[PDB]
Structure formats: C-alpha cells, structure tokens
Amino acid sequence: LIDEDDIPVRSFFPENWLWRVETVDRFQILTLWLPDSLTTWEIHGLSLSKTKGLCVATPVQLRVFREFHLHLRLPMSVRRFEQLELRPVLYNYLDKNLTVSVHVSPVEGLCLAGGGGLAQQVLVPAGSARPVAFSVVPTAAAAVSLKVVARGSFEFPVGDAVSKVLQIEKEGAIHREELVYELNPLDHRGRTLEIPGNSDPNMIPDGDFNSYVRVTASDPALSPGGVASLLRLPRGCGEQTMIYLAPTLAASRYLDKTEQWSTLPPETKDHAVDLIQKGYMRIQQFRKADGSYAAWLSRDSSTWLTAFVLKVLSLAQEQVGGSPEKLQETSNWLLSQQQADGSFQDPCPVLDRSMQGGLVGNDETVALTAFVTIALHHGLAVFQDEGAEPLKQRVEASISKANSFLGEKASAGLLGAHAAAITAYALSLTKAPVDLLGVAHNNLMAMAQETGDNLYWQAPALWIETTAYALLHLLLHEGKAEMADQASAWLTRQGSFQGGFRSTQDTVIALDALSAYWIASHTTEERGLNVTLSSTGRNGFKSHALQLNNLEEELQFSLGSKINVKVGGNSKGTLKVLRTYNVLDMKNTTCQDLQIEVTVKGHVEYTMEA
Amino acid sequence: KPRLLLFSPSVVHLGVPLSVGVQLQDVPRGQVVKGSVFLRNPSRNNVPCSPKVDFTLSSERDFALLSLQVPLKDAKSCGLHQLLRGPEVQLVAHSPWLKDSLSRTTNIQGINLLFSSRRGHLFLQTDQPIYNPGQRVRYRVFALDQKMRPSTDTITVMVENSHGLRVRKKEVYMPSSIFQDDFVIPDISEPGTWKISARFSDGLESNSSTQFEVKKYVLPNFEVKITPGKPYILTVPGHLDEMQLDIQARYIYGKPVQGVAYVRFGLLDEDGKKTFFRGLESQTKLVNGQSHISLSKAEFQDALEKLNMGITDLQGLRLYVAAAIIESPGGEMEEAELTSWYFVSSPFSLDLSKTKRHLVPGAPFLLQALVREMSGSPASGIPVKVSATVSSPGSVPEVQDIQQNTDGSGQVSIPIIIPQTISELQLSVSAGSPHPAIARLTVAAPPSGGPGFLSIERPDSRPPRVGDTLNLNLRAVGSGATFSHYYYMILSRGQIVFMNREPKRTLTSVSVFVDHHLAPSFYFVAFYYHGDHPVANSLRVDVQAGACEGKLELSVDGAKQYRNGESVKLHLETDSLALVALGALDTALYAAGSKSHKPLNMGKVFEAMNSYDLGCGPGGGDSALQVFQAAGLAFSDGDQWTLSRKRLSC
Amino acid sequence: RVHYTVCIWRNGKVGLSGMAIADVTLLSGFHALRADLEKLTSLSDRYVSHFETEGPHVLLYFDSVPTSRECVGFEAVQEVPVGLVQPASATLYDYYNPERRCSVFYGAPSKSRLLATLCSAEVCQCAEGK
Amino acid sequence: VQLVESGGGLVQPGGSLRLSCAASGFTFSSYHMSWVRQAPGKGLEWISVINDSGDLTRYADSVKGRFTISRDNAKNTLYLQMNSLQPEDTAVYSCLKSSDFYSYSNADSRGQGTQVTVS
Ligand SMILES: *[C@@H]1O[C@H](CO)[C@@H](O[C@@H]2O[C@H](CO)[C@@H](O)[C@H](O)[C@H]2NC(C)=O)[C@H](O)[C@H]1NC(C)=O
Ligand SMILES: *[C@@H]1O[C@H](CO)[C@@H](O)[C@H](O)[C@H]1NC(C)=O
Ligand SMILES: *[C@@H]1O[C@H](CO)[C@@H](O)[C@H](O)[C@H]1NC(C)=O
Ligand SMILES: *[C@@H]1O[C@H](CO)[C@@H](O)[C@H](O)[C@H]1NC(C)=O
C-alpha cells in the first residue's frame, strides 16, 4: 500500500508554540510553521510602546485541521511490563469509503501483539471513524517513540501518521514520607535537631530520589482632643511660663511619638512648634548668669525649677536648634549645688508649691535628688560630642554619687509611695548597679496597690503622678510583663476624664509615660526564623539557607542521608521535610468494586497465524 | 475675607508625582500670593518629604495646577517607614500671605493625606492556563508606570506553591520593560492552583499576581459545553417554565462529535452539596453534535416529591447538570458541568448602582438603572416603572409615578421632579412584566437651612466616546449669591488632571473634552462659594471602553483551513514602534478541566487603570466636605478641612 | 457470526451506589449485529436499558448492577478478516463518577487474555512470534 | 550577532555538499537556529530548525530526509548536509537566528549565506 516514508509523519504536538517578544517598526511579518497538531490555535498579542502604551490585540483563532487524520491519545501514566492497549482512532471526513492499513512500527523496547509491522486492515466509511486497538506491553525503561502508519488502498491513496514518546514510569508506586517538626529558637534545648535518614526496607534501591523541605511561620491611645487642648500659649512670670510650657512640650512630644498629628489639622502642628519657639524664648530671657532659671531675676535660684527647665529644654533641643552651651552651664550649676553625700539642697523653695507635684510632704530630699538625676540624664543628650569633656565626666561622677545615695536610701525602705516611684525610675534610667536596681524595684512591687481588673494605685494628683513614674520603670525594667499593660490602661482611663491631669507635673510625666508605653506595645521586630540544613550526601557535603523574615518557604535540596538542622532567629514556626521514593507495591490486577467479564464464542477468520 | 484652597487626591502614592490644585478665593484683585507646597510628616519634626514647588498664583488667574514630585529617597530620608500608626503624611502649602494679611495663627495651610507605595501597573502572562507536573513554566511581566507607559524599575517576581509556599524569588533589573523567565514544576507536585506574584522592588504593596492551575491532565480532543435555552428558570408559584437545555459536543478542529451524552441532574446549594436525582438521567445520541433534553413539569415534580424538597424550597438552589459525552466509536469521554441555572422568581435584574444618592432639592433627580437580564448581557425594551413618593414635612407625601423603556444599552435615565421642601424621597422601581424585578431604595434630602446647593445636569445621558465633548449644565439652586465664577476640576484615577473656572451666566454650559487621560471613568467636581461656605456636587461619568490607542492588529490571509505543516504569515501592525508580545495557545487547554480563567484583555487593563480610583459611589454629597471625600479629594480652605481617609478602600 | 457474553457484577456496599456504563469494544475487524441487539432491550425485563453500537464499539447503560453475576450476550457480523491476533479490551464506568473505571481484557475464543511474556523477578521479555 | 557561513560552491547533483555557519556574540545553547533557502525569484521558505538543545529537528517536505541538520554548542557551529542534491535546490542558503523554534521574524537576525549552484 502507501509507502511508509511517503506519508508525512506528525510528531510535534506542543501545547504552546509562540512565545516571542519582538520590536515592530509599525509593520513586521513573521512566518509561522504550524505545529503538527490538529486543534485551534488562539493566537493573542500584547503591544507595549513608549508613546501610546499597553494595547491588547484581538485573538486570531487559527484552526488547523486535516481531512483524514489519525488521532492517538497515549495514557498519561503507563507502567512497565503491564498490559497496555492503544486505540488510535481514524477519522474519515472525506466523501468516499476508505480501506486503511494501521500498523505500529517495530520499535525497540515495545512489545506489539504481533511482534512486528503486521498490517491491520479496517473499513472506515465516509464521515465516520473506526478505532484500531493495538495491544502492547512496554518493555523499555525510560521512553519509546512509537509511530502509527495508516496506508490507504492502491486505487484511492490517502496517507497519515502520528508519532509520540511514551514515557514509562519506574517500577513501584510513589511513596512520600512526612516528618513534622517544630521550631523554638528561644528554647535552649533541641535547637540543633537532626532528621533521621531514610531506612524503609520497601524503598527501591534503584530509582528516582526527590526530597523537599517546607518551613512556615505563624505569629499569634489617649484622646487626641484632650492632649491637643493642652497646647496653651506660654505667658506669666518665669514660673507660670513653665506651667504653660511643659504640658505644651509634653503634648507636642506625646502626639509626635504616638503619631496622632493626623487627627488634628496640619495647621495645629506648626502652631505647636511656634509655641515651643515662643516658650523657648520666654524662658531663655529669665535665665540667670549661670543658668539658674529662677522665677524672678531678683529672687534667688531654685534647683528644682532649674532641674525642671533643664529637662524641658533638653527635650525641646531637637525641635529648636538653640544654644546648647547655655544648658551645659545650667548642668554645671546643678553639680555645684550637690551636697556631699549626693543630694541637692534647693535653698529657695518655689513660691507656688502646686506645680512642684508630690514632692511636698514629710520627705523631699529623696524625691528631689531623684528628680534632679532624671533631669541631669536628659541633659546628657544636649552635651556636644566635642568639648566640655571634664564637665561631662563631672556629671557622670555626680550622678553616680547621687545614684549611689538613692540606692542606699531606697534600700532602707520606710519611704512614701511618691519617693519610691521616683527613685525606682531614677535608678533604672541612670543605669544603676543591678543590686540597687533590684531592691528598689522589689520595694515598689510590695507598695503597689490594686482594687480591680488592671486597677493600680478621678484620682488625686499624688496617685496619678506616682503611677506615671512607676509605668516608666516597669517599661524599662525587663520590658512589659502584663503589668505596664495593666498600669498604662489605668492612666488612659484616668487621663480620659474631663479636664484630666489636674496638676502640671503629673501631666508632663503621665504624657511621657503613655507615650513610652504606646511606642513599646506597637513595636514590631524583624521576626526571623532562618534555618540551615547540613548533611553529608553521596555527592558530598551540601548546605542550604532559608531566610524567613516575612509567609512560608519551600526549597529543593540534594540530600539523601541523615541531615542536620540549625534553627535561628526568634520566631517560632513549623518545619517538615518531604522525601519521595518508589516502593515495591503489588495489588490485585482485577477490578475491586465493579467487575466486567466478557467472553467470545465462535469462529474468527485469520490471514497470518502463529 | 480672602481664602486659599488646597486640593489633592486623598492618597499620595510614593514614587509618582502628586497633582495638587490651588486657587485663590475672594481676593481684593490688587495683591498676589506666593508660596510653595511640600509633603512633611510631623512625626519626624516636620522634616520635608518632597521638594517644594513654585506656588505663584496670580489674582487674575486664581486657579493653578501643581505637580508635586515625590521621590522614593526623600520618603525614606524623612522616615515614613518608621511610622507605626498606619501610613500618614501631611501636605502643606507654605505662604507668608496667610499670616501677614489674613492674620491667621500661622503661615501654613495643609491637608492630612494617606499614602502607599503601590505604584505602576504590572501584568503577568503565563505560558498556558494549566500545566501538568514536570513541565517547564514560562512567564513574563510587563512593568508600566502610572501613565501606562513602559517603566524600567527593578522588580521582584516570586512563585507561590499550591500550599502558599514561595518556591522562587528573582530580583531583576528590567530596562527593556519586559522580563522573561521560566522554571520547572516538581514532578511530585500535588494538584492545585499556584500563583506568580511580582512587584516593583522599591515599592512593597505594588504587587500584581497571576495564577496558573497545575493538575495531572491529558490534552482533551473535544470540548463539550452545555448551553441552556434560557439562563434563568422561573420558580414563581403556579408557573414553572420548562427546563430545556441543549448539549453541544464539538471536536476542537470544529467538526461535530458523534457520540452519546449521559446526563445527570441535581440540586447544588450555596455550600456545595449536591442532591442528585434518581432515575432522571437522560442519555441520547448526539445528532450533528446536538442533543436537546428537557424535563417535563409532571416528572420533575415527582422527582422533587421523591426528595420531598418541594417547589417552595427552590429559593436559590442551583440546578447542577453534568454530562459525560462518550464519543463512539472513539471511546474517550469529556465531562462538562453546568453551574449557572439559578431558580429565580424575577426574570430580570435591576442594577441601581449608578443612581447617585444625596438628592438635591429644587433640581431634577436623575434616576439611573441598568436593566440586565438575569445571568446575561443587558437587554433592551424592558419597561420600568418608578413610583417616587416625595416626603412633605408639612403636607401629604405626594405619589409620583413615571414609566419608561430601556434605551437599548440596558440603561434608563428617568428624571424625577422634586420640590425644594422635601425631607426625603422614597422610590420603588420595577422592571418588565410579568413578575417584574423590583428594587427599592430611599434617599434623604440633605439638612435644610444650610448654604445653597449646586445641581449638575447632563442633557446627553449616554456613554461618551473618547474625543466626544460632553456638556454639563451647572445651576445654583440655593440663594442667589453673587459668586462670579464656577470652579470645576476633573479627577481621573485619583489625579486632578484638569482644573478650570467658567464664568456664571444665565445658562452655564461647560465643555469637557474627554480623552484617553479620562478612561474608563472620571469624576467632575464643581463648586462655588456662597459667601464663606463652599458648595459642590460631583458627577461620576462612565467613559466608554472604546479601544486602546496602541492599535495592535494580528491578522492572516483568512482561509482557516490550514493543513498542519503549512506556512502561515502573521501580519503585525502598530501605529508606533513598540514591543510586541505574542502567545499562540491551544484552545484545547481551555477545555482541559479548570476554572477557564480568561486571558489578559483590555477589559482587565482598564480595570488596572481604574484600580487607582479613590472616589467611591456615583457622586453627590449632603455636605460640601462629604462630596469632596466621596469624590476621592483632599480639600482644605483654612477654616474647613477634609478628614483623611481611614483606609485605602471605601 | 460470533456470539458475545458480557457479564458484570458488583461487590457493592461502598463506592458505586449507582448504575454503570459498559464500553465493550469488539475485536478489531468486525461490528456487532444490529437486530440481535435491540431484542436485548425489547424485553420487559430490561437489563441493558439502553444501547449505542457503531463500528467495533458498543455502548451499554446497565441501569442496575446486582451483587450476583449476570450475563447478557449478542452476535456480531464480520466484514474483514482480522489482521493479527491480539487481545481486545472492555471497560465499565460509574454513572455518577466515571473515574471509577474497570478495565479488563478478553481474547479471541482460541487465544489468551494477556500477551505471551515470560517475566523473571526483575526483568521480563516477550515471546510473541512464530 | 555575527553569523559567518561558508562551504558553498557549485556541485554536480548527488555531490552531497555541506554548509556550515558559526555564530558569536550570544549564548548559542539558548537560541533556536535555522536554515533558510532564498530562491532567486521566490521568497523565503525556511528548511529546518534544530532545537535549542539539539535533539528535535524539522524539515520541509521538499527536503525531508534529503537534507540533514546538526549543531554542537561546544564549538558554536551548526551544519547542514545536502544528501543527493537536486538541481532545483540551487539557491542562497543563510542560517537564521530566531526564538521558540516555530516562528522566525522577518529580520530579527539573519546571516549572509552562500549561493549554492548546480550544473
Ligand atoms: C499583594 O499581596 C498581599 C499579601 O497579603 C495581598 O493582600 C492579601 O493577601 C492574602 C494572601 O496572603 C489574601 O488572602 C487577601 O485576600 C489579600 N488582601 C487583603 C486585603 O488581605 C494583596 O492582594 C496583593 N496585591 C494584589 C493581589 O494586587
Ligand atoms: C461508504 O459505505 C457505505 C456503507 O453503508 C455506503 O452506504 C456508502 O455509499 C459508501 N460511500 C460512498 C461514497 O458510496
Ligand atoms: C539569621 O537571622 C538572625 C536574626 O534574624 C540574623 O542575626 C542572622 O544574621 C541571620 N543569618 C545570616 C546568615 O545572616
Ligand atoms: C485481592 O484483594 C487483596 C486486597 O488488595 C489483594 O491483596 C489480594 O491479592 C487479593 N485477595 C483476594 C482474596 O482476592
């Protein structure tokens, strides 16, 4: 019949055949060689130009079809040495009867029913199709290219052929091993765990090896209106100006850190900066020769107001690029006012003790010493990195001497709630030695008072001031451990009252406390869980890295023996490694649930017989 | 009382210019105002985050449009990323004229703005919609700037596994504006849907992702589609239209499939459970690739009775039909499932998303309704009845009824006369008959006693093509203040692309030439000042898709009878030098079991362009601020400001 | 003239809970006879319940599949000598889940179901020839 | 992307002439290579395209089997053997550079080629 070489062979059956990006000078013609597949090719385009822009094109439905075509649909999965049936169907769309001769060529690695190119004849009439079953068993190992040749009769020749590669899966089913494991970087035990190597006896020694590792990571404010209203215009004497300035700076800084300026109009922010600048000038002109900062020039100095001014001005030094050496003189003046044991005298009390806060009482020296130490530490930032070195060294010496005094006084106990709170914060802020830090913190713990859920210490000016100082200490003392969270909540409710923060010292301290707490809670860490895999495989020693800062990750690693794990970071996650290998599995060949058996009785003619 | 107005979109996108509009109000005609505009974050001591701009607006030409460059480096330097309480940046205008002349508290006026790093458009194109494990996946990503012009910024493309696990992350410089990559699916991959995500490296939430399904498939030879007679099945009491459906099996090359179709029916509820029928399976020989099958009323009732479900229970259950066509003598079978038959009382569906709320007393309330046939394209000639009941605060609520027919594009623009005393308007719309589809909404008039109201009236009421100048009629409905001019601006994709003023007259006609800069839709915000307070009323305008101006035309010499191995010349035509990306896919792959997700087409492109739109709703607003908020604008007149958007979405 | 005997049963109690479709494929070279096939359907006791035969392919829709073993047969008309000796095949599908196939093979009356292939523990070869 | 080609010259039919062209300036193993015949009066019909890796190849029906393509990435050289040359094959053959193995753009990157002739 038709010569097998004469008939064209169809072998290129791509699922996608035009994946080029090219430049067109408004007109370009590209020739296409249609793949040997009988389908409809939905050609689509996408033009990108620097002038016009993206412009999708109308798909060009290209239909490729043949009159008398042979269709061969190989099964996706075929095993070796197992009965396989081929059903290439011949389609006859021509307007005449056809006598075809379908035969699979004798390709090595395949086991035809006849064993060779034995022509099989079939009658396919016009406008109809007839399958031609061809039973084979694949004896090869990797793949075999089997072609089908349909030869028409001598009088009416019509040729067609189809070639495909039949990939044979390796012996045995597919087996996947799951090793669920946890990751606790904080844990001091099990950090460098190991994965046992594969030891399943059913594992086929000769086969494809694939391994994979999957790592995951699963993580578990005060009213803007009230604080804004505190941006009062400084005025009055050298003392009354501070009452209107410290809250102005505190609210300005509280909103700054809490990031609440969005709620208020943008004109408010620059209104605040103007008030700070205006308040900065107002208190500057009240400065004495040595930075005393007294209420009146005639009136002698009061270190409390000087210490308070140093604290307030030092904080504002970022907003206003003012003269820092003036403060350096003020800090120097404070040292000259330090008593032998480390306390501070303050010979002249301020006229209006209301703004002093809770200092007034049975004991004032301990609170005053701590208060000055807090301010002095705040003044360390403003000191220029160059120059004034001996003045700085004197500050660390004086503060340490006072710092040592506070611990000695604090350890004695028998001190009021206010004094303990200030000292607790002063000790922590100034980086006191641990021994003195602990005793002061322990004393505060016992004195802590509660009356309900997250209740601690409107409340009177003394209690509100005292709790604020405590909150800073707890935040600085080994972070927040569900005590600052509870204590801060108490302040938020207390500060949300109408006209909250009655006094002035409580306002500046409390606003700093909540701001410090707020920035503490809304703090996000890197949250890394990077791990590395180490093993000594047959090919050698290999390593891997899996950065998981921020999600899950997968990675293919070429390891086939026991492997080592090195967890790191601080985030807890789950690690589970997948190994895939083929196992020796054999089940019934017959059907299990539904069974069909067909038998044939009769006489069938033959042409070539064994 | 001179005033300065500051306009800018409610969201500023990092790395792209921010269009800021400023115009003087009530100037003595004898002085000029100078200054500058910049972006500053107050959390970092008011450190500017953008270079200042030449403010310089004269009294003779009050309106002026400013483009604020917002480089990425400046944003980092002033530390926006260090922000904790969400993204917030302030836009301020610095001009000493505010303090010296207006005697304001300070010489700064600004607006609270949100911001995000989402910038540019990224489109991905996988090699084919579905892969089987072990094959090589090819994909490319197109980087486009905000103006839909090709970009050259560094991008990071990452592939996510079916389980959500990243299996690739390539950070690549893409000067050509097109990046072509290709990886391989693991052979052991379990069936599922993957995802390819890309984003500009500088940005963080500027990502656009495409998905490709992976499963163990073999290319089907023919595709079978169950096309019903009607997309909807009436379930009203008493009347139940026959459920007739058509089955079509066709070889991919187009010739009819001669086989047998085995069909099984069942009810599929919202959750997904199927309640199949027993004995209802109808199998017929496909004649010319067609097999009509229907369920008679009596037998269907018996089947429901067998399941004791009852007709009354067919509220929204979806009739599930699966066909298993076996081509004979071929042998192979392909399954097709129908999941679009909703048992709905109403044959039609009224879409009233285009009617603006916030009716303006004293001006006609234009009611827009889209009469889309249920589960189908918009229909024409469906009468719609509107019964508006205007509420009279001091009299009986008059009942007004108007009837109209669909224009032909599915939309009806029915005006409604409304007196200026109405407290609120209640209207019920019913479309078609019998069993009309009814939709009811209530609109409340803005609070009375305030300043005047502005009413935008569009005589045309048809979708404007690009290059078609559409006219809007502006009318001041409140007190007859002597405001000289009408100020209006056009917002397209959250950008003020045009600002202007039109003098007041007996008739106020404004010509808005619509160009590609306005697509697929834009806003038209116009306002005037009744002495001190502002008055405004926006109007969203849906611009027709039309077509892309690139004009890429794939074409061949017809004759779609190509025998394989033949040379077919493809003609590529474009109006300018451009990068052309070509993909030739097998239609069978769309037949292979999957969700049949559509490719990239201009409908999806314009969705990306409109994805940056900030305004939500058809427009209109009870207060001047609200209309500016809903329009996606950030506005401040010194004495009145606009609250920052609480989220990136409405 | 050759008489088929198609038989189907079902262990049941799990999986199927439904009817089945038979895809019995005739030995290449001939097609099932027409008249003898309808009489399988004409009977009131209608096991086959439907059919569609064309070429060497016969499709049956067994509306019910009992636990026991039943057998329904028909004759076939021949028109061309069978080109070569080989086993044919037939499959049974589940109506509500056609994935649950049941593939089998059947040879000519004087042949064997499976190809002559001697297989060792690890390697197997064919002896298909004269 | 120079594409130097050589090996032409008139040959009696049946001479089995061999044409070879070597390329440079790009990664040869990543790009599909082809041969194109250019008849004096006709257009371009492109004979064969050896796959990126070098295994799959195509041939025009007019040369199927008669001609034979081959490549080797190591030497960046690509060959074509014209067994049993038919006097109608006389033309100028110029190896072509393209992508995706199925379509060649008009003037993406074409060589010079040599005008083979037959007596
Ligand atoms: C960019 O990626 C983010 C990832 O969070 C997408 O946002 C969410 O992503 C999760 C998947 O982790 C989805 O389940 C959510 O639906 C996404 N949206 C929201 C609001 O969480 C974001 O959609 C991506 N950008 C795109 C797709 O343009
Ligand atoms: C093909 O064979 C059928 C057999 O029934 C016959 O009816 C038909 O006429 C034949 N074709 C032509 C063109 O005669
Ligand atoms: C792993 O993570 C930790 C903490 O996130 C980091 O300090 C370390 O540098 C990381 N590993 C490497 C190799 O960088
Ligand atoms: C068939 O059933 C079991 C389960 O697969 C199989 O292992 C065994 O070879 C067969 N046993 C019987 C009794 O048929």
Side-chain angles (χ1 to χ4, degrees), chain A residues 586-588 590 592:
Chain A
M586 204 58 262
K587 302 305 176 188
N588 291 324
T590 53
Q592 315 316 333

Side-chain angles (χ1 to χ4, degrees), chain A residues 551, chain B residues 118 160 195 197 204-209:
Chain A
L551 280 174
Chain B
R118 178 171 171 74
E160 301 185 10
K195 186 202 300 319
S197 182
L204 187 50
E205 68 275 15
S206 73
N207 53 341
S208 80
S209 50

Side-chain angles (χ1 to χ4, degrees), chain A residues 15 29 47 83 97 116 206 281 308 420 425 457 519:
Chain A
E15 318 187 288
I29 316 171
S47 161
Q83 193 62 225
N97 309 114
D206 46 348
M281 295 298 102
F308 189 16
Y425 177 37
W457 280 279
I519 189 167

Side-chain angles (χ1 to χ4, degrees), chain A residues 13-154:
Chain A
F13 307 159
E15 318 187 288
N16 182 318
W17 65 287
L18 192 66
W19 192 248
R20 69 187 317 166
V21 56
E22 53 170 339
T23 304
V24 292
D25 291 331
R26 292 200 58 172
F27 188 76
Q28 205 170 25
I29 316 171
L30 75 166
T31 312
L32 281 60
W33 208 352
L34 294 148
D36 283 328
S37 164
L38 298 194
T39 61
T40 62
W41 292 114
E42 182 261 322
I43 297 179
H44 47 245
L46 189 44
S47 161
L48 178 48
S49 78
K50 296 181 182 60
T51 74
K52 314 291 174 172
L54 198 62
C55 175
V56 187
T58 51
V60 167
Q61 305 289 358
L62 210 56
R63 299 207 299 98
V64 62
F65 163 85
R66 207 177 187 82
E67 304 94 297
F68 168 70
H69 77 88
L70 191 148
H71 181 71
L72 202 173
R73 190 151 167 254
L74 282 183
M76 56 216 87
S77 60
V78 58
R79 222 68 52 72
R80 61 183 311 168
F81 300 144
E82 301 195 16
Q83 193 62 225
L84 184 75
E85 76 300 350
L86 291 178
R87 193 149 44 169
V89 290
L90 293 97
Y91 292 80
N92 189 358
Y93 283 113
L94 279 177
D95 63 49
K96 295 300 294 186
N97 309 114
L98 293 174
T99 61
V100 298
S101 178
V102 190
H103 66 89
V104 178
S105 282
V107 287
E108 301 66 70
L110 261 183
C111 181
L112 311 188
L118 283 188
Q120 157 59 43
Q121 201 143 29
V122 163
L123 294 174
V124 59
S128 277
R130 314 261 80 89
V132 298
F134 267 107
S135 195
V136 302
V137 287
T139 58
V144 290
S145 177
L146 77 169
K147 68 184 293 189
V148 169
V149 163
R151 314 172 179 180
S153 178
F154 294 104

Side-chain angles (χ1 to χ4, degrees), chain B residues 122-126 139-142 196-198 208-210 600:
Chain B
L122 273 163
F123 302 125
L124 304 93
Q125 214 185 23
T126 44
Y139 75 109
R140 62 201 168 195
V141 302
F142 306 92
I196 305 182
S197 182
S208 80
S209 50
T210 190
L600 191 65

Side-chain angles (χ1 to χ4, degrees), chain A residues 526 528 530 547 569:
Chain A
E526 57 93 19
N530 48 8
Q547 278 73 7

